[PDB]
Design a protein around this ligand. Structure first.
Ligand SMILES: *[C@@H]1O[C@H](CO)[C@@H](O[C@@H]2O[C@H](CO)[C@@H](O[C@@H]3O[C@H](CO)[C@@H](O)[C@H](O)[C@@H]3O)[C@H](O)[C@H]2NC(C)=O)[C@H](O)[C@H]1NC(C)=O
Length: 496
């Protein structure tokens, strides 16, 4: 009865967003927006282009003012579900956004009639990623954190906090001039955003940028952190990521443990090719690293502490923190009380801070001929399981528990030769995983224990999800065994 696949014709897919509330999926495609049921049933379709456009011109694109306007396709740049609306940002018209009714994709709520430079949100070029994070203000108001990667005018701050629904709704998607990360030489740093996410009272960003502190000026992986309430980016701090000592320098994808939202960040990294492309085919390798978010916070906190009170030196020895992006600021010898008084900083504290000391992780998975593009991690019966996507449109399933090499328990083709989107998202019950490539979307079950009819078959075909439920006479997940005697396939040791 329900579709098992979604293959839209005459388009390529960019983004996927799941509505936690209703289960509804939204799809960002070239000149199209789709609304699907949790069962992949097509519910609504909206056209987004082509449009008369030019990156040199400002919206509304007027032919008399922009004679070089030519029909342009509109790949989806950003697609996020907020309590009130569906947030939609395209590659076209300077990365302007809109708000659509959730469940009624056709219904437009807000699309500013005559927008200004302060409302150009997303990267106005496909080929360049944009990241987003829907959060709340102190009053519960909806905020959108944006990671706009550098586009060759696009002199827009790399990270911003824009209001989704302010007093004047015509002023939506604008940041308060203060709520941004001012970087003076964006062309030189060349940001490449991967993911944006939250934990506690903080928004975090995963990205590549050139490490201009190094004579090499080579691209490096970084984790970034700002307080959710901080409207001046005072609390902003950067940490270099290492996996393992930069052998796999380029971060590709990351996800946190979900079954709800863990405390560990799982990040797929690929080794670099001679813009920051990962070495392709058998010449390049990938690795999966785990960075517990407390370790992230410990280091950011000690980067802040050093920079605030002990001139970024930090006893005993020394030179652990500094001011990044060439900003005319320096680390300080401020009172100790500053740490407690100003956790998210102030007008007097040094900003933007960054660590000299990187956050180091050793891989748990090291795949020599594979180029990882997507990460999704879940937890079944306390055991950590990872669903990883690659450049060839494969989906590998990896048990990541005690004493296991990064080897996959299964590998399947989603779409030969088409990279799996970073947008790997489970369903409400964690029974399925939505797996998207550039031309298809599949509702992939997390297990098929059911397929094995006897105990012999159930244990012979090792899946961490599966075991033999004795009292039920069925091959199942532990949760389905009712807690009774359940013969786990990864730990058989008799007696059937
Ligand atoms: C990084 O530094 C920040 C402070 O700048 C640390 O935040 C403080 O962490 C403590 C530890 O839990 C928080 O205390 C607890 O708050 C909970 C919330 O209700 C309460 O139930 C506990 O009984 C306890 O009071 C404190 O509120 C928090 N303050 C702020 C401003 O966040 C953070 O924990 C440090 N992280 C690491 C990894 O070191």
């Amino acid at each position: 009865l329900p579709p098992t696949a979604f293959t839209p014709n005459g388009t390529y897919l960019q983004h996927l967003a799941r509505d936690p509330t209703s289960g509804t999926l939204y799809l960002g495609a070239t000149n199209f927006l789709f609304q699907l049921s949790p069962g992949l049933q097509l519910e609504a379709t909206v056209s987004t282009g082509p449009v008369l456009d030019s990156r040199d011109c400002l919206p509304p694109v007027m032919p008399d003012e922009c004679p070089q306007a030519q029909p342009t396709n509109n790949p989806n740049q950003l697609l996020l579900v907020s309590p009130g609306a569906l947030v939609v940002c395209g590659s076209v018209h300077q990365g302007v956004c809109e708000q659509r009714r959730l469940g009624q994709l056709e219904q437009l709520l807000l699309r500013p009639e005559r927008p200004g430079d302060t409302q150009y949100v997303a990267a106005n070029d496909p080929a360049v990623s944009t990241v987003g994070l829907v959060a709340q203000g102190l009053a519960g108001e909806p905020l959108l954190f944006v990671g706009r990667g550098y586009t060759s005018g696009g002199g827009i701050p790399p990270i911003t906090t824009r209001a989704l629904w302010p007093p004047d709704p015509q002023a939506a998607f604008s940041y308060e001039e203060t709520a941004k990360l001012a970087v003076g030489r964006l062309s030189e740093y060349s940001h490449h955003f991967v993911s944006a996410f939250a934990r506690g009272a903080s928004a975090y960003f995963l990205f590549l940028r050139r490490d201009l502190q190094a004579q090499s000026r080579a691209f490096r992986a970084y984790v970034s952190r700002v307080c959710l309430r901080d409207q001046h980016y005072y609390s902003y701090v950067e940490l270099p990521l290492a996996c393992e000592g930069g052998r796999y320098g380029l971060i590709q994808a990351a996800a946190v443990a979900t079954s709800a939202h863990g405390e560990v960040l799982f990040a797929a990294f690929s080794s670099a090719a001679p813009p920051p492309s990962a070495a392709a085919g058998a010449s390049g390798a990938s690795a999966l690293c785990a960075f517990p978010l407390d370790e992230v916070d410990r280091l950011a906190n000690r980067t802040r502490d050093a920079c605030y009170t002990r001139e970024g030196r930090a006893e005993d020895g020394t030179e652990v923190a500094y001011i990044e992006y060439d900003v005319n600021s320096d680390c300080a010898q401020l009172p100790v009380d500053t740490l407690d008084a100003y956790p998210c900083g102030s007008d007097h504290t040094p900003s933007p801070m960054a660590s000299r000391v990187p956050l180091e992780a050793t891989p748990i998975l090291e795949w020599p001929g594979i180029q990882l593009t997507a990460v999704a991690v879940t937890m079944e019966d306390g055991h950590t399981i990872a669903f990883l996507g690659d450049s060839q449109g494969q989906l590998h399933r990896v048990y990541l528990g005690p004493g296991s090499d990064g080897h996959p328990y299964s590998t399947q083709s989603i779409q030969q030769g088409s990279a799996v989107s970073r947008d790997l998202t489970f369903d409400g019950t964690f029974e399925h995983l939505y797996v998207m490539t550039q031309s298809t979307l599949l509702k992939v079950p997390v297990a098929s224990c059911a397929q094995h009819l006897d105990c012999a078959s159930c244990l012979a075909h090792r899946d961490p999800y599966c075991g033999w439920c004795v009292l039920l006479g069925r091959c199942s997940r532990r949760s389905e065994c009712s807690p009774e005697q359940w013969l786990w396939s990864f730990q058989p040791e008799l007696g059937c």
